Amino acid sequence: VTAFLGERVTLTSYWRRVSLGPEIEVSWFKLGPGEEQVLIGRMHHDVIFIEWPFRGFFDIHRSANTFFLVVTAANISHDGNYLCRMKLGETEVTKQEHLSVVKPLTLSVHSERSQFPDFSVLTVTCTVNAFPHPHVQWLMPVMKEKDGSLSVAVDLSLPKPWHLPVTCVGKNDKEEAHGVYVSGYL
Amino acid sequence: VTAFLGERVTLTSYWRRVSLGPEIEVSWFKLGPGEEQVLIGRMHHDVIFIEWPFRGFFDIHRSANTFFLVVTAANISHDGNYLCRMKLGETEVTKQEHLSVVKPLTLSVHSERSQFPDFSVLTVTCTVNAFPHPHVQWLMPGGVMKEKDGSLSVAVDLSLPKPWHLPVTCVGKNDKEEAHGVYVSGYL
Amino acid sequence: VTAFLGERVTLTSYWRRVSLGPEIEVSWFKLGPGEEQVLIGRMHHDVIFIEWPFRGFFDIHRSANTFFLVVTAANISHDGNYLCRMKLGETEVTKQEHLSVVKPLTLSVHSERSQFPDFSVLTVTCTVNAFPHPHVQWLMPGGVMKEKDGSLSVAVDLSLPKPWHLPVTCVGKNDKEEAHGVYVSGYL
Amino acid sequence: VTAFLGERVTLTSYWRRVSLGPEIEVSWFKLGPGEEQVLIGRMHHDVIFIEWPFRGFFDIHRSANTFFLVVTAANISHDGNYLCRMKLGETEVTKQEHLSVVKPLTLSVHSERSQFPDFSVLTVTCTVNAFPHPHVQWLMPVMKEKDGSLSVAVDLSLPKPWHLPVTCVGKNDKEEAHGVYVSGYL
Amino acid sequence: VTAFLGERVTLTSYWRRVSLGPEIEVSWFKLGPGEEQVLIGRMHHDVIFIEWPFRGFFDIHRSANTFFLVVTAANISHDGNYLCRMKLGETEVTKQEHLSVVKPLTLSVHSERSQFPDFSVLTVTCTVNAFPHPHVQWLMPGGVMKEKDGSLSVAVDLSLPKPWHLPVTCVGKNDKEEAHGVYVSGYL
Amino acid sequence: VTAFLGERVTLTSYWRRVSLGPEIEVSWFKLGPGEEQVLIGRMHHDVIFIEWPFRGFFDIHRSANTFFLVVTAANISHDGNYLCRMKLGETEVTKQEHLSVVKPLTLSVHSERSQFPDFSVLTVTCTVNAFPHPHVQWLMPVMKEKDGSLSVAVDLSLPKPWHLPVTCVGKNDKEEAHGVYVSGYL
Ligand SMILES: *[C@@H]1O[C@H](CO)[C@@H](O[C@@H]2O[C@H](CO)[C@@H](O[C@@H]3O[C@H](CO)[C@@H](O)[C@H](O)[C@@H]3O)[C@H](O)[C@H]2NC(C)=O)[C@H](O)[C@H]1NC(C)=O
Ligand SMILES: *[C@@H]1O[C@H](CO)[C@@H](O[C@@H]2O[C@H](CO)[C@@H](O[C@@H]3O[C@H](CO)[C@@H](O)[C@H](O)[C@@H]3O)[C@H](O)[C@H]2NC(C)=O)[C@H](O)[C@H]1NC(C)=O
Ligand SMILES: *[C@@H]1O[C@H](CO)[C@@H](O[C@@H]2O[C@H](CO)[C@@H](O[C@@H]3O[C@H](CO)[C@@H](O)[C@H](O)[C@@H]3O)[C@H](O)[C@H]2NC(C)=O)[C@H](O)[C@H]1NC(C)=O
Ligand SMILES: *[C@@H]1O[C@H](CO)[C@@H](O[C@@H]2O[C@H](CO)[C@@H](O[C@@H]3O[C@H](CO)[C@@H](O)[C@H](O)[C@@H]3O)[C@H](O)[C@H]2NC(C)=O)[C@H](O)[C@H]1NC(C)=O
Ligand SMILES: *[C@@H]1O[C@H](CO)[C@@H](O[C@@H]2O[C@H](CO)[C@@H](O[C@@H]3O[C@H](CO)[C@@H](O)[C@H](O)[C@@H]3O)[C@H](O)[C@H]2NC(C)=O)[C@H](O)[C@H]1NC(C)=O
Ligand SMILES: *[C@@H]1O[C@H](CO)[C@@H](O[C@@H]2O[C@H](CO)[C@@H](O[C@@H]3O[C@H](CO)[C@@H](O)[C@H](O)[C@@H]3O)[C@H](O)[C@H]2NC(C)=O)[C@H](O)[C@H]1NC(C)=O
Ligand SMILES: [Pt+2]
Ligand SMILES: [Pt+2]
Ligand SMILES: [Pt+2]
Ligand SMILES: [Pt+2]
Ligand SMILES: [Pt+2]
Ligand SMILES: [Pt+2]
Ligand SMILES: [Pt+2]
Ligand SMILES: [Pt+2]
Ligand SMILES: [Pt+2]
Ligand SMILES: [Pt+2]
Ligand SMILES: [Pt+2]
Ligand SMILES: [Pt+2]
Asked: Which cysteines bridge via disulfide bonds (chains B, C, E)?
């Protein structure tokens, strides 16, 4: 499933076949490296307990034979693989679900003339912030953010006479924006 | 003169025809609201004193008969008029110089999709920060915020229901300065 | 329903006789002072939006024809009445549910002896913290403080001159909830 | 001597026999491990100097041939052994005095029902904070505090049907309180 | 009695002719603005209680028939009058004692040269901090500042154009206390 | 050149002979140990760029064939040697200039009687704060400050009867002040 940052989102699991609902002992885990398990919460007979680190971040519920992991507001740490362990008696079945969290890209353009040796060089900067894959490219004719998003910036230095307009292509997988520097202040 | 934000800048002045160099008493004033003349500093006989509030932000020096007010890193408060008063004995001449401080525009584009009743509405946001005159406008195929640095920000939202009227282009300006941002395709 | 402080809690609602599941527009409201209905969130066609002030604190989901408001960790502000509004076309039905939040009582006993004119007077202090209704009372053989968490504290002092009228028993209550604390012997 | 937390308290020493009052050079030390000496203050000819770390915490004075260490407000760091060194000429006599600081016990009772797998288990918690020796015990039919006191807590888990009332016995040497959980909210 | 800032100090009192030691109820009061008597502490039968606001700052003890109020580290707020009230049965006697707290003066000298129009003017600054009575005066060959500690500071500037009228001597006082600071030669 | 703390100050350099003004590429460096170079700024064709650590602290300019380093407000870190590198083509000439920063001295006198064994000893303290060379000396008949200045203090202990007046001599190279303790409070 794909969620955008801040959106409610849901993963689901079910046992089989097996149609036994509230009798199944359900636990959901967030998977780390290399598939290391961190318990989010447990459900049995429609009594649910969320572990304190995930409280308000995740909930669990049942509808018939389907088990739900709900993410109240997706953030970038929530990206990746989850494990639903379903247990009846001394028997057990696990299912893996994937959540893709996507921060829509922000494309910024800004320019700055040189200050030494003279003021004749226009450096145009193009910045893409996004998740998972920001990408930046100039046409002529990197950093980790507090929220876990990634920023990339590229400078184009332009000797006089300035090759204006220049177009910046920002991408986040299939998402794309352009930034066009058209003319200088002077 | 025009200076971009952060740049070393220079205003200049000289007297005439009067080649007297260090004999001339020079004082530089920042002109305020107002009519008010606020002293930056003085130079005479190659002794330069810069008033405490301006220290580090402005300097004064002479090259022969030319007098210089140096702004060490142009900030938006430095935008406005300046006065160089030159004195010899009982006679004075005054020269008025303008400094334009410009922050080059930053244009940003980003989109967000709707979360209720469904996920079908794209809102695309275009933000221009600049000084003195940011302006933004959406093309198809809200206050001024004052930032900490004195520059001004302006933002416009455009909502697109399905089918998204894509290629949308944002036009940003700051006087003659111009940039665009084009939202081409969503992530899906 | 009754929830202790910190517990996951659930209010439920369904329409009738009307087995329409995802076709029904559900909204949940917290009832305020007041007469005021404050929107927690909405569900329709299995798209759930929780208002920003309630995000993380409440969730909404459906199981077939039953609608659930989940409180993720019951706090004392959550105590009160809730409204589930169910809509189909132009017709609505509304269900009012109550949540009672209870903090289980804490009873504390401690004694302190007098320091002047001498060391012979024992004062024994009994403190009950709970929600909604802490109450304390001393048996032989002062404001309500509002805590940060919304719970209420109540304290009673009993002074005993020599010979100390020991076994003293403190009785603490919170509605039907009951605890005692008995001061048996001093340190000497 | 026994002082309770916050009470003024006094230790005393004297030389012998020897009846020579203000002529004796008196110094008091707080004893650490293993009897390590830390100077509190000195007295001679009724001139007294308290070392800055103990200033406002301790004073010293004389009455005739008796030397006094006064503790202005006993705290738990003041618990333990003190040394009075009494010096006349190149001769010297030391006496050891003991201060017991006692924090009267606080007994707390609180209960909490289980949240998973169901809500049927009552865990009753009984906490004793005290100094020197808090102790807790349940009848059916650990941590160090900022002020230097010690807290101990014990949980009794009760399956349904709840074995109510349960009585908690708190002790601090001979000090004793009981905590009785009598009935649940529901 | 006189105590310098930071010193252990003692006021004393006794009754008469009345050799009753521990039988006497003693209380010590700090006298305020005002006419107001503020209780420091009490002693009776060798039980001493010091009021919470004075704890650590003052103590009381007895040696036979003499009663002592000990100030553990004299501060400037301790300067003023004190009352020892001695009681036996229904009869009382009261003794008034004065504590003078003195901060010994600090005298500082420093010079600064002028920066405009030239470097030829020396200003020499002399600062006296003390309690109760700092005073400063320049000899040839402006408020009181209240410091955090209750002491008082006083500063005088003397400008000297070339040729500098050197040996200049600063005279500092605090009642009978006296110090000088002499500026002898500049750095050049 | 000598500057006092807080004063504007100037260093100058020139190439030769060579009379070619704005054609020369000028860079000024602050010298550390052992002559390590830290760039302050560069000038060429009367375009000047000051490096951000020195911005508002230093400026550079030309008057004809003379190159100026200006220090806007001298502080103690600015004390020591500077290097002017002057470059034309692949040829280069460097000149060393020295700035002496001087904090005028502050002489303080204060006295304090003993507190143990009795109150009969007058300790008079004399403190000189200065830069570069504070010095203190008592006549009978060390520390580094936040601003980089140096403080030195000397105590004179005086048994009764007090040898008053005592005179303190403060020096900072040729700068000199005296402090005279003339009489006690009591
Ligand atoms: C993204 O979501 C994750 C949860 O899935 C967020 O992490 C959680 O953040 C909370 C709030 O900080 C953590 O609780 C803090 O814990 C420490 C004790 O270790 C304590 O000092 C605080 O009072 C508070 O309880 C919680 O442990 C943590 N959960 C996990 C599983 O890491 C993350 O902060 C979210 N936001 C962003 C922007 O990433
Ligand atoms: C833009 O440049 C102006 C200066 O031309 C900057 O203003 C000056 O700012 C400094 C603080 O860095 C002020 O110095 C402070 O003044 C207070 C107020 O009396 C004093 O308490 C402090 O110790 C300190 O000296 C200075 O007076 C002020 N000068 C003016 C306004 O003429 C301004 O900070 C810069 N703005 C930005 C956004 O960088
Ligand atoms: C008990 O639960 C209620 C929620 O049902 C908690 O109140 C909510 O508390 C949060 C803060 O954690 C508020 O979010 C903040 O609001 C301010 C004000 O506009 C905003 O500046 C912050 O950025 C942040 O979003 C939220 O609005 C508020 N919701 C309400 C009152 O409906 C409350 O904090 C909990 N109380 C305790 C004692 O835990
Ligand atoms: C219990 O009583 C002892 C004294 O018998 C208390 O310790 C003393 O606490 C004072 C106040 O903190 C200490 O003075 C601090 O010293 C540091 C320098 O090391 C400085 O940063 C502060 O301005 C202040 O002077 C004092 O040194 C310390 N004395 C000893 C002998 O340790 C203890 O704090 C008392 N209270 C409790 C609750 O334990
Ligand atoms: C000089 O000595 C006097 C005492 O004789 C000092 O005043 C006392 O100062 C303490 C604080 O260290 C006060 O204790 C505090 O009072 C507040 C106010 O109610 C309370 O919130 C705090 O928890 C704390 O107990 C005390 O009441 C006060 N006594 C008085 C004024 O009689 C004073 O601090 C000393 N001054 C200097 C400059 O050292
Ligand atoms: C004496 O003058 C020197 C400069 O010649 C002063 O040093 C400079 O001080 C500024 C202001 O702190 C430094 O900029 C700080 O840099 C850090 C990053 O490393 C950043 O956290 C701050 O926002 C700020 O930019 C500057 O780097 C430093 N320059 C040098 C060459 O060291 C010194 O502070 C002056 N004053 C005194 C009393 O010494
Ligand atoms: Pt996916
Ligand atoms: Pt970044
Ligand atoms: Pt010239
Ligand atoms: Pt803004
Ligand atoms: Pt369904
Ligand atoms: Pt309270
Ligand atoms: Pt003992
Ligand atoms: Pt604890
Ligand atoms: Pt006695
Ligand atoms: Pt002051
Ligand atoms: Pt020099
Ligand atoms: Pt120092």
From this structure: 126-170
Task: Please give the torsion angle defined by the CA atoms of residues F154, F158, F162 and F167, in that order, rounded to the nearest 10 degrees.
Answer: -20
Residues A29, A82 contacting (CB under 8 angstroms) = yes
- Residue A134: burial class (beta carbons within 10 Å; 0-12, 13-18, 19+): buried
Q: Chain E interface, mutation test: which of B28, B46, B49, most E Cβ atoms within 10 Å?
A: B49
Q: How many angstroms separate the CA atoms of A133 and A79, rounded? A: 13
* Structural contact between residues C131 and C151, judged by C-beta atoms closer than 8 angstroms: yes
For residue F129, the ligand closest to its alpha carbon is 18
**D-contacting residues in C 125-184 (Cβ below 8 Å):** 174-184
- The C-alpha atoms of residue C4 and residue C104 are separated, in whole angstroms, by 7
Pick from D50, D62, D63: which is nearest to E72 by CB? Answer: D50
* CA–CA gap between residue E141 and residue E170 (Å, rounded): 11
Which stretches does DSSP call E strand in chain E?
2-4, 9-14, 25-31, 37-44, 47-50, 58-63, 66-71, 80-88, 91-113, 122-131, 134-139, 145-146, 152-160, 168-174, 177-185
CA of B181 from ligand 8 middle (Å) equals 20
- Chains B and D are in contact, defined as 3 or more C-beta pairs closer than 8 angstroms: no
To which residue do tokens 């050891």 refer? D96
d(CA C79, CA E107): 68
Lookup: tokens for D12 = 């005393």
- Which structure tokens are listed for B123? 């809102």
Q: Where are any strands of DSSP class E within D51-165?
A: 58-63, 66-71, 80-88, 91-113, 122-131, 134-139, 143-144, 150-158
Give Cα separations from A54 to A57, A59, A82, B96, C73 (angstroms): 5, 8, 13, 65, 11
Exposure on the CB side of residue F79, measured as CA atoms within 13 A: 15
Q: What are phi and psi of B76, to 5 degrees?
A: -70, -25
CA C71 distance to own-chain centroid:
13
Resolution number, Å:
2.3
The DSSP letter of residue C176 is T
Question: Relative to the CA of C58, which ligand 3 atom is closest?
Answer: 5
Task: Judge contact between B122 and B160, C-beta under 8 A.
Answer: yes
Q: Which one-letter amino acid corresponds to residue B140?
A: M
**With a 6 A CB cut-off, is A145 part of the ligand 1 pocket?**
no
Any atom of ligand 4 within 6 Å of the Cβ of D149 = no
β-bridge partners, C9: C71
Which residue, F131, F133, F144, F126, is CA-closest to F173? F133
Nearest to C167 by CA among A117, D176, B142, B136: D176
- In sequence order, the 6+-apart residues with CB closer than 8 A to the CB of C186 are C111, C113, C122, C164, C166, D174, D175
Sheet holding D58-63, edge to edge: D9-14, D66-71, D58-63
This structure was determined by X-ray
CA distance F41 to F49: 6
F8/B contact by beta carbon, under 8 A: yes
Q: Which of F39, F75, F78 to mutate to test the pocket of ligand 6 (most atoms within 8 A of CB)?
A: F75
Quick one: CA dihedral F118, F124, F129, F135, positive or negative? Answer: negative
Query: Residues lining ligand 6, CB < 6 A?
Result: F 53-54, 57, 75, 77-78, 147-148
H-run or E-run covering C60: strand C58-63
* CA–CA dist B24, B64 (Å, integer): 11
Q: Is residue C75 classed exposed, middle or buried when 0-12, 13-18 and 19+ CB atoms within 10 A define those classes?
A: middle
Collapsing DSSP states into helix, strand and coil, what is residue B23?
helix
Out of D57, D58, D144, D145, mutate this one to test ligand 4's pocket (max ligand atoms within 8 Å of CB): namely D57
Ordered by where they begin, the domains of chain A are 1-103 (2.60.40.10), 104-186 (2.60.40.10)
